[PDB]
Nucleic acid binder design. Structure first.
Ligand SMILES: [Mg+2]
Ligand SMILES: [Mg+2]
Ligand SMILES: [Mg+2]
Ligand SMILES: [Mg+2]
Ligand SMILES: [Mg+2]
Ligand SMILES: [Mg+2]
Ligand SMILES: [Zn+2]
Lengths: 107, 115, 69, 217, 37, 129, 69, 95
RNA sequence: CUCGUUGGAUCAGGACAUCCCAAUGGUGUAGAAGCUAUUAAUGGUUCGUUUGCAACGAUUAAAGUCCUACGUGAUCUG
């Protein structure tokens, strides 16, 4: 329901949703994203895909990171934009047509 | 003074929380009659779309004399049954947890260092 | 120097006169029996008291450092 | 003559009799335990008994970053970093569960406070736990280490660049542009250093205290 | 000791009493039958 | 008197499957002795743990304060903390997973601590050409 | 790979001797613990890993068998 | 490769504000003026997630289900999907 | 053949038709949870998320039901 945009993405969180897209797309095997996002042949790590796509979009942000010696604001790749931008493409059909409930047809 | 919404450091080795990615875990609930939680006080922590109970082992607020004040708010993830999630705790843990009212011996066994 | 060491905080500013008195709480109802009944008269010289009087739990200075054996 | 800071009374309306009583108790403890001379920035090792443990003591090594308190309430904070975790402990000089105080390195730093080390790089506050004591020369002036530390990114626990702190041990130039430094001076408050009624003169008191302190011997 | 408008005996052993300004039926055999007005 | 020899002897009486005794050097500000024991079943842990505590209360400790029983919330790990000795009792599955013995036997070479490495100081990710 | 295969044999054998000299901890368990660890770790190793793993016995044996009593 | 996504304590969440609840009352009030009811749902999620309130509350009037956004969905076995909808009783369905 | 003031903040006063604390009866009250009833107004009676009030999440010994012209806009605000 969140993936198709029926519910507001804020409360669920794009980051958590972004993972579900990778799992579903990988399970389905429709590796459309790799062509649209030139990252690698295939991947199933949510962290890995988010890292590279941010570089592709040249998106970065400054995020506070907790460390033993204090709190330091250190520039970091903009993971959030990757989730949001990645999500938008899926619903715009760039990745490809999918059947979220493909498992249930056998019933 | 750990309260609601505080970003906290999971000083542990649990794969769920110890891995360095995602936003720092935020405190949702403090198991005290007062909101403020200090060393040895349990708190409810939200991690990666999940609610996990944790235990405070250090904080940045000044304490009573002869007590260790850390430079970051440290917390340890604890299962519901009380067994700690992580198998090891290498960063020093204050020894006051032994005499504080509650069950802390399990954490002390896991924590090799002591300050 | 006629100095009494009283636990915690006492009302008033520093150099403010106070009214010290035997406690009226129920637990302290009969604590005056052991102490001098009317008062202590040094002029009587019944006994020569030390300069400093301590309580058993108090750790006096110049004693060995406390060890929690 | 190094007079420990706590001995000097703070000004006010308190009667001297209160200080005299406290000094007598303090001097008695000094006989049992010797408090070695040290200044902010010196590395110290303190042995203290742990109430939680049974007949077991503990030691903590760190650089003394602050000296505070007067009389029997005097305290000092010494800092160190262990396993990449910074720790600060406030220690009471006359706490009866302190066994020994050791001055690993007797030295003075450009600043009267080293609180800004929290914003400095980790190396400037890391000290070896087992570092051996260095030789010391009594018939000398206490060495003044003039190291200027390097700071971490701009957001600091406090605005150390501001004139009120008067920090003289930070390399501002590397961390702060010249324009920022001029902005800080808008809070300079130059008049304070030249008002003759803000000065607390303890020449007579320091002389008076030294005789009595030495008299007890 | 249910407070009811009408007090009615529930057993032969039940007896009536007038205690502290109100009517009571107390049954030795069964404490259940105890009532108040 | 309540002591290590009596405590371990009582453990052998109740027949704990696995018994481990570790002397703790005074350098660590912790218990003098550290003991680990295994148990056949969750009931076995409850029975033995209660039995040891009951003996402690009867066996002296008049001046010493009493000891809480921890781990009753869980079903696989119960730990009891005496002033000078602490005994952690866990089932075989819990024991192997945590590997308590290696931690205390090897203070700083334990593989679990060896696997963990000090995190690098956060360095800004800079995009280049 | 190791510092010396003679030391490995000597070291492993030394642990077995130490186990025979024990008072409180179970004799059987200690033998099993050393055997299982030695059988696994020492089979496949590199120069760095083997040197570190061999360091166990040197520190462990020379430290009252890790505190075992 | 990969494995089934584990729940691991994940919780279902919803926003369901007042206007969503207030709007439902008007649907009940305005039911009389409605000759027939059209159910519009996303094609990519035919029946995994649905609102049961409509069918029970609006079951009185005739209801026909239409699955929009068919372009953004894969329909290799559309015929099978209709059978499941027909199995539920919603035989008349247009994409 | 369509419809007719009020949240919140601050401070709260009182009623008891008692939510919790306290004192008890009966029990289809073995022990442990309860259920039913009476007496009692003593102090207490949570923090948020969605946001138009209805839900929700975590807690608490309990998160009472009502009156005081939304209790209270010459105290403030939607
Ligand atoms: Mg002050
Ligand atoms: Mg601050
Ligand atoms: Mg009121
Ligand atoms: Mg009543
Ligand atoms: Mg609010
Ligand atoms: Mg008015
Ligand atoms: Zn009857």
């Amino acid at each position: 329901l969140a993936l198709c945009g029926t519910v507001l993405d804020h409360l669920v969180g794009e980051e958590t949703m972004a993972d579900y897209l990778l799992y579903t797309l990988n399970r389905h095997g429709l590796f459309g994203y790799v062509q649209h996002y030139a990252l690698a042949s295939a991947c199933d790590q949510i962290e890995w895909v988010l890292k590279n796509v941010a570089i592709k979009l040249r998106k970065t942000r400054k995020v506070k990171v907790l460390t033993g010696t204090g709190n330091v604001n250190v520039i970091q790749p903009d993971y959030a934009m990757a989730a949001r931008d990645f999500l938008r493409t899926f619903r715009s059909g760039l990745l490809g047509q999918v059947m979220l409930d493909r498992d249930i047809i056998p019933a | 003074a750990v309260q609601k919404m505080t970003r906290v450091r999971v000083v542990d080795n649990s794969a769920l929380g110890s891995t360095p990615y995602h936003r720092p875990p935020r405190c949702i609930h403090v198991y005290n009659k007062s909101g403020v939680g200090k060393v040895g006080d349990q708190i409810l922590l939200a991690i990666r779309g999940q609610k996990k109970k944790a235990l405070i082992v250090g904080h940045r607020m000044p304490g009573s004399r002869m007590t260790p004040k850390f430079d970051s708010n440290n917390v340890v993830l604890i299962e519901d049954n009380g067994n700690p999630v992580g198998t090891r705790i290498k960063i020093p843990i204050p020894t006051s947890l032994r005499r504080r009212e509650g069950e802390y011996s399990k954490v002390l066994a896991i924590a090799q260092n002591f300050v | 120097h006629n100095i009494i060491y009283v636990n915690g905080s006492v009302p008033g500013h520093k150099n403010c006169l106070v009214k010290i008195k035997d406690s009226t709480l129920p637990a302290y109802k009969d604590s005056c029996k052991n102490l001098p009944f009317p008062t202590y008269f040094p002029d009587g010289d019944e006994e020569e008291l030390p300069e400093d009087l301590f309580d058993e739990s108090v750790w006096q200075p110049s004693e060995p450092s406390i060890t929690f054996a | 003559r190094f007079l420990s800071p706590e001995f000097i009374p703070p000004r006010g309306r308190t009667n001297p009799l209160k200080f005299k009583i406290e000094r007598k108790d303090m001097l008695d403890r000094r006989k049992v335990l010797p408090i070695p001379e040290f200044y902010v920035g010196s590395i110290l090792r303190v042995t203290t008994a742990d109430p939680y443990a049974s007949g077991k003591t503990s030691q903590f090594l760190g650089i003394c970053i602050k000296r505070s308190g007067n009389g029997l309430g005097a305290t000092f904070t010494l800092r160190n970093t262990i396993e990449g975790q910074g720790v600060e402990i406030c220690f009471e000089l006359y706490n009866p569960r302190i066994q020994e105080i050791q001055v690993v390195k007797l030295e003075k730093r450009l600043d009267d406070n080293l609180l800004y080390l929290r914003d400095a790089l980790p190396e400037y506050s890391t000290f070896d736990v087992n570092m051996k004591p260095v030789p010391q020369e009594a018939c000398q002036e206490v060495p003044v280490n003039k190291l200027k530390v390097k700071m971490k990114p701009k957001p600091w626990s406090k605005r150390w660049e501001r004139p009120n702190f008067n920090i003289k041990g930070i390399r501002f130039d590397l961390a702060l542009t010249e324009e920022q430094m001029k902005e800080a001076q808008k809070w300079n408050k130059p008049w304070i250093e030249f008002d003759m009624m803000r000065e607390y003169d303890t020449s007579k008191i320091e002389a008076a205290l030294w005789e009595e302190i030495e008299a007890s011997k | 000791f249910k407070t009811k408008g009408v007090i009615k005996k529930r057993c032969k052993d039940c007896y009536k009493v007038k205690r502290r300004g109100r009517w009571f039926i107390l049954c030795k055999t069964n404490p259940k039958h105890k009532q108040r007005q | 008197k309540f002591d290590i020899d009596m405590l371990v002897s009582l453990l052998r009486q109740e027949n704990a499957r696995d018994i481990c005794v570790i002397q703790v050097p005074p350098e660590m500000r912790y218990t003098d002795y550290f003991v680990i024991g295994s148990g056949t079943s969750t009931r076995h842990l409850h029975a033995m743990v209660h039995y040891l505590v009951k003996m402690y209360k009867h066996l002296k400790c008049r001046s010493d304060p009493y000891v809480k029983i921890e781990g009753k919330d869980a079903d696989d790990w119960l730990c009891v903390d005496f002033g000078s000795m602490v005994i952690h009792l866990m089932l075989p599955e819990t024991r192997e997973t945590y590997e308590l013995e290696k931690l205390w036997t090897l203070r700083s070479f334990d593989d679990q601590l060896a696997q963990i490495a000090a995190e690098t100081l956060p360095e800004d990710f800079i995009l280049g050409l | 790979a190791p510092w010396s295969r003679e030391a490995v044999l000597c070291l492993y054998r030394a642990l077995l001797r130490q186990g025979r000299e024990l008072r409180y901890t179970d004799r059987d368990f200690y033998f099993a613990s050393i055997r299982r660890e030695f059988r696994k770790n020492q089979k496949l190793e590199n120069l760095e890993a083997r040197e570190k793993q061999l360091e166990k016995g040197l520190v462990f044996l020379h430290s009252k068998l890790g505190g075992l009593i | 490769w990969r494995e089934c996504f584990p729940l691991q304590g994940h919780d279902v969440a919803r926003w369901f504000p007042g206007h969503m609840a207030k709007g439902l009352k008007k649907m009940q009030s305005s039911l009389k003026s409605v000759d027939c009811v059209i159910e519009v749902h996303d094609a990519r999620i035919p029946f995994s997630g649905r609102n049961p309130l409509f069918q029970e509350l609006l079951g009185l009037k005739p209801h026909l289900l239409v699955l929009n956004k068919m372009d953004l969905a894969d329909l290799t076995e559309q015929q099978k999907i209709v059978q499941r909808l027909e199995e539920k009783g919603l035989s008349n369905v247009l994409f």
